[PDB]
Amino acid sequence: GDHIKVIYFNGRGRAESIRMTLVAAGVNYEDERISFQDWPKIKPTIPGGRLPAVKITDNHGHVKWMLESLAIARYMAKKHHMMGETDEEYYNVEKLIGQVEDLEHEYHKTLMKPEEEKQKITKEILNGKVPVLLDIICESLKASTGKLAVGDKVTLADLVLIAVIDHVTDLDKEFLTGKYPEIHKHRENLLASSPRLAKYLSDRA
């Protein structure tokens, strides 16, 4: 009920979509970062043994657990009308989430690898599915009925798009420079449409 605790390990990993949803909805939460050396003793206490996870405690001390980051974000976005106003908007929200998920899948391949292997996979996907999936997302952004990803108000599709673009720029600062104008335009409109999210991203840097 009352207190929402986000348990995670990666600084800007899958938990970013939970935080950005809560911030855009104006809901408070507490960060609980688990460390590498502590994870062996913490894992048996997490249902499913996987992070990130969400812990909810009420006025009375009863603990409710929530698993699977994007499932958690979908629930919080639904509760605050960030999953489309209609069934047709709901589809378009999920359509962009699915495409963002594919781009995130390619980015994830480079994670937790030795320096030489990480460089090899980065070089491979940047010449591969990353530009192909970026063009697909740009077409989905152009088909919007408003200034944001789906319609004119914030939805979950807006948030996971910001998170995955920051992952792309992590692979290459210059990869989007002078290209993909609809992606640059989406972020500018999104910051202008939610000052709380802009406050969150500005202070995070």
Q: Is 70 in the site for a copy of itself (CB under 8 A)?
A: yes
CA distance 56 to 78: 17
Q: Which residue has the tokens 């812990």?
A: 55
User: Measured from the CB atom, is 78 or 191 closer to a copy of itself?
Assistant: 78
Q: Is 39 in the site for a copy of itself (CB under 8 A)?
A: no
Residue 52, contacted partner among a copy of itself, Na ion, none, CB below 5-8 A by kind? Na ion
Residues 71-110 that bind a copy of itself (CB under 8 A): 71-72, 74-75, 78-79, 87-88, 90-91, 94-95, 97-99, 105
Residue 13: CB minimum distance to Na ion, A? 3
For the CA atoms of 133, 150, 52, 103, the dihedral, rounded to the nearest 10 degrees, stands at 0
CA distance 106 to 145: 29
Q: Which parts of this chain interact with Na ion (CB under 5 A)?
A: 8, 10, 13-15, 52
The set of residues, in sequence order, having a beta carbon less than 8 Å from that of 167 and lying 6+ positions away, is 12, 104, 107
* Residue 29, marked binder: no
Express the helix, strand and coil content of the chain in percent, nearest 5 each: 55, 10, 35
Residue 158, contacted partner among a copy of itself, Na ion, none, CB below 5-8 A by kind? none
Q: Is 140 exposed, middle or buried (0-12, 13-18, 19+ CB in 10 A)?
A: buried
Q: Diameter of the chain by CA atoms?
A: 54
- Residue from 42, 136, 138, 198 that binds a copy of itself (CB under 8 A)? 136
Binding-site residue set: 8, 14, 39, 43, 51, 68-69, 102
Task: Give the binding site for a copy of itself (CB under 8 A).
Answer: 47-50, 66-72, 74-75, 78-79, 87-88, 90-91, 94-95, 97-99, 105, 132, 136, 139
